């Protein structure tokens, strides 16, 4: 079903704008935003993997040492 | 770039021919440059650099 909208949109032609410089514009703010918003998500992804890997290597090392005469 | 535009981009047939020519010549140039880098990086290791080549008794 079509939606009934009321809006005014103004647009500039693609050939009247700079195309690429906006990628490296306010880069530190972009990094700020990605880190600040995503640090819990990143912790929940990485910590179980690294913790489990480290514990497995620790277990393997101690087990190898225990069987050594 | 407007002068080059008036010779290459006014007709799509010329533009398409220009694209075909660019593919041909650019791929040849890149091939040549990559082979130059390969030769410069492997001096002395080629089959043609075997000291005794042709000298198996």
């Amino acid at each position: 079903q079509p939606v009934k909208l009321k809006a005014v949109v103004y647009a500039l032609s693609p050939f009247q704008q700079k195309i690429m410089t906006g990628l490296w514009k306010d880069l530190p703010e972009k990094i700020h935003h990605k880190v600040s918003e995503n640090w819990i998500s990143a912790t929940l992804l990485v910590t179980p993997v690294v913790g489990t890997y480290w514990y497995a290597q620790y277990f393997k090392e101690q087990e190898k040492l225990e069987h050594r005469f | 770039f407007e002068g080059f535009y008036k010779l290459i981009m006014r007709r799509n047939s010329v533009y398409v021919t220009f694209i075909i020519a660019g593919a041909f010549f650019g791929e040849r140039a890149v091939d040549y440059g990559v082979h130059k880098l390969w030769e410069r990086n492997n001096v002395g290791k080629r089959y043609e650099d075997i000291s005794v080549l042709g000298q198996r008794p």
């Binding site: 939606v3 009934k4 909208l5 009321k6 809006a7 | -």
Partner: protein, 116 residues
């Protein structure tokens, strides 16, 4: 109640997080309710006044534009947002009660979802 932010600080943090996320886009929590998810939502949306639904659609368009542009609402527009000002839940509850009444008396449903 564990869901009440007035009692559980975890619920309070949950509410604050959701409110900040909605405020960034100018969206209301009721705007997240989609007429394609449930037929009861579609019915409730159809019962609402044109002005409420128009404001919802405008907020959705503004949010989609911001999402496309990778930008949030300017902080001055963020200060005047009302993320949990409700317009839909009461109508939706009334619709669900009416459907339950129809089912309890053995009547045919007033609307059905198509089989995809």
């Amino acid at each position: 109640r564990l869901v009440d932010p007035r009692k559980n600080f975890l619920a309070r943090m949950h509410m604050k997080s959701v409110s900040n996320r909605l405020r960034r886009y100018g969206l209301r929590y009721d705007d997240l309710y989609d007429p394609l998810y449930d037929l009861d939502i579609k019915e409730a949306l159809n019962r609402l006044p044109r002005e409420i639904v128009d404001a919802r659609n405008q907020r959705l368009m503004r949010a989609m534009d911001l999402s496309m542009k990778h930008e949030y609402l300017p902080d001055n527009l963020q200060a005047v947002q009302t993320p949990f000002r409700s317009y839909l839940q009461d109508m939706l509850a009334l619709v669900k009660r009416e459907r339950a009444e129809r089912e309890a008396l053995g009547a045919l449903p007033l609307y059905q979802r198509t089989i995809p």
